[PDB]
């Protein structure tokens, strides 16, 4: 589960950068789509962790 845990950390880093990008910005649908995509990956990784 070390591999999954490290990928969670990597995707969380990317999620934080997308929140930084989006805050106070011009409406950016492409970046919003990537935000939800990264969250979907995080959710899937955590589901795998719990069996």
């Amino acid at each position: 589960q070390a591999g999954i845990k490290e990928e969670i950390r990597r995707q969380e880093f990317l999620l934080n950068s997308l929140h930084r990008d989006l805050q106070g910005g011009i409406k950016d649908l492409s970046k919003e789509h990537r935000l939800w995509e990264v969250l979907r990956i995080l959710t899937a990784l955590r589901r795998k962790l719990r069996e």
Binding site: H19, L22, E32, L35, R40, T43
Partner: protein, 173 residues
Amino acid sequence: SLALHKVIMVGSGGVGKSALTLQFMYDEFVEDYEPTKADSYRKKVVLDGEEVQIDILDTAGLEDYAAIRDNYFRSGEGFLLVFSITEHESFTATAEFREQILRVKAEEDKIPLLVVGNKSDLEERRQVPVEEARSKAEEWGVQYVETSAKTRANVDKVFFDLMREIRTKKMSE
């Protein structure tokens, strides 16, 4: 995109945002309570004969950072504003949640939204009279639905009805 509808679960802690999401997504329900940070899901469904996808963003009952909350709320196309019928304070909290949604989407006129009174299986513990919640939803111009993520009562209905509101808005544009 008329084939992808973006739904956000909003409401205070413990009301069943994640339970509704996971019942809808996977037909699962567990009694455990693990507070959400943020989670997201995608599902293919048939909505009135057309094959579409629903994206769901499941939020924290209380977000540490205003910017994170605003980023999530601004990205949604429609909202399920959830409270628990067993916790009156969660019902009163919906008013401020709605204001936050309206502020962050200020260029949009009528935001697709439904008020969801969850935990309808716990009728004997009700603290929110049906009439109080119905009246508030009428004042906001939205549907009120009572749900149970545990028994599946009206769970599909709230997600499909919100998708229909989003589809209506998208066609009007």
